[PDB]
From a paper:
Bacterial infections including Salmonellosis and Shigellosis affect millions of people every year. These bacteria use a T3SS to secrete virulence factors to manipulate host cells. The T3SS is a multi-component system that forms a continuous protein transport channel through the two bacterial membranes and the periplasmatic space that extends into the surrounding medium by a needle structure. SipD from S. typhimurium, IpaD from Shigella flexneri and BipD from Burkholderia mallei are tip proteins that are thought to interact with their corresponding needle subunits PrgI, MxiH and BsaL, respectively, to make the needle tip complex.
Here, we address the questions of how the Salmonella SipD interacts with PrgI and deoxycholate and the mechanistic consequences of the assembly of the T3SS needle tip complex. Multiple copies of both proteins constitute the tip of the transport system in what may represent the open state of the needle.
Numbering used by the authors: 6 to 77, 129 to 178, 186 to 335
The structure:
Amino acid sequence: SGYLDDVSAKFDTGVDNLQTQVTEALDKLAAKPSDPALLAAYQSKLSEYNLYRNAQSNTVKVFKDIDAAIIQISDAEIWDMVSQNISAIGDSYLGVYENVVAVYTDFYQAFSDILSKMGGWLTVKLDVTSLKNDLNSLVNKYNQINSNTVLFPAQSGSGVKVATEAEARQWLSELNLPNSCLKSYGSGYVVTVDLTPLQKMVQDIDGLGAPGKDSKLEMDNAKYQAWQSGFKAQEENMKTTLQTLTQKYSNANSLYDNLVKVLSSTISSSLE
């Protein structure tokens, strides 16, 4: 509709550039495989590329609203009007990250609850059975597909919402989660919490050996320290996953704010 074609066509150039940048970022990383900086740069670019492809596949719905509102102009007002007419984007980008962090925070919080009754389970004697049982119930509970376990899509109220394999895999790589987090359900797929640290924990408790009639098992300090160390390490792993996803979210808010600035500029300029 008039300038809209100008915003979109100029916008497509953006997707091409990011696409090129992603590859370029990836090659720099290929030269130094374990370089943290280059990895972070590449994934921010990947996320950003996905964001623009998001916007692109929503131009109709979005240009509709924005245009309808341009028809009832300041620049801080262009920005404002753009800000409140791109929910199709923010909800499938930021809203997704919002859900990802809330769900993972509750998942972790549930683990914390189990950790909170360790004293009541402690040479030294550990309640192998009681501990392993609480862990296994956590594994099974979060190994299912419901509102407490799904990171993407966001589960809106009642009923399970799925996505295509491609969409789920896209989020799987952006969230940097492992294959075990991708599950099939009905017509499509979903991305859930990573249970690997928890499963390693029980796998470690079993390595401790068969418990006594106590259903508990006494062990000499040597192997106790080694066990609790291995256990605390798995906990830090979950805690690290929660932090990295929180950091991805904060980065996405920034990338999103820059997409809105660009969108606003192209529109404001398409007038002049």
